[PDB]
């Protein structure tokens, strides 16, 4: 690892500098090096890891969708043959996106998940596992697509079971997990009714638990609750 010679604390420090500089590739490389030191991650350090790769893969996904749309138009009735370049470049971006997903999943499997005992950490990592199998699913088209989808579902489901038993309905990780599992149902698993039912139930149960929270915790939950409301308005 190119980060093997840098102190763990220095990697965390530089990941925070990279975030301030919006250098998310650097941020992700620093946090990969931090994870590979072998120590568990703190709550703040987990957020740095997820934000870094979320932004990296986020830009790859947006570019993939631009290219895939161009590719789909090029294969319509009446479109002039432009050669293999559009497919080639879409495959280039797709392959880089899959490498990032494989890298995150490798970190979760070696060895973040197995050493995660507290609900907040274990649910967090299992959500990540579901997220990055979902991103693999968004671009999957071959003989392993169904197993990729089920790997996302399986990771999300174990996270859901833990979060419902160990976390209050307003916990931001529990809310973000449910939001994304609902998106998985709608966009990946062809289960729009399940996606809608999950978003409603999640929102309503969090609504009924807000009275227990301080002003700061109240603000934290409602931000993600609004995303649940946004998707319901989009979907209904």
């Amino acid at each position: 690892g190119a980060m093997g010679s840098m102190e763990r604390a220095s990697l965390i420090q530089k990941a925070k500098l990279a975030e301030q500089a919006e250098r998310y590739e650097d941020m992700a490389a620093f946090m990969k090096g931090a994870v590979e030191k072998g120590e568990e991650l703190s709550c703040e350090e987990r957020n740095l890891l997820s934000v870094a790769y979320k932004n990296v893969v986020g830009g790859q996904r947006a570019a993939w969708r631009v290219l895939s749309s161009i590719e789909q138009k090029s294969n319509e009735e009446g479109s002039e043959e432009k050669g293999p370049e559009v497919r080639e470049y879409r495959e280039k971006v797709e392959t880089e996106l899959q490498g990032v997903c494989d890298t995150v999943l490798g970190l979760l499997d070696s060895h973040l998940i197995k050493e995660a005992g507290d609900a907040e950490s274990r649910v967090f990592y299992l959500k990540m596992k579901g997220d990055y199998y979902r991103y693999l699913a968004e671009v999957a088209t071959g003989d392993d697509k169904k197993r990729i989808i089920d790997s996302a579902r399986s990771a999300y489901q174990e996270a859901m079971d833990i979060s419902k038993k160990e976390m209050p309905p307003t916990n931001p990780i529990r809310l973000g997990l449910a939001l994304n599992f609902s998106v998985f149902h709608y966009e990946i698993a062809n289960s729009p009714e399940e996606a809608i039912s999950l978003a409603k139930t999640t929102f309503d149960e969090a609504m009924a638990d807000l009275h227990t929270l301080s002003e700061d915790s109240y603000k934290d939950s409602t931000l993600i609750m609004q995303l649940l409301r946004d998707n319901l308005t989009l979907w209904t």
Binding site: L179, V183, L227, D230, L234
Partner: peptide, 6 residues
């Protein structure tokens, strides 16, 4: 349209 996630 793409749904919101987090």
């Amino acid at each position: 349209d793409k749904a919101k996630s987090c």
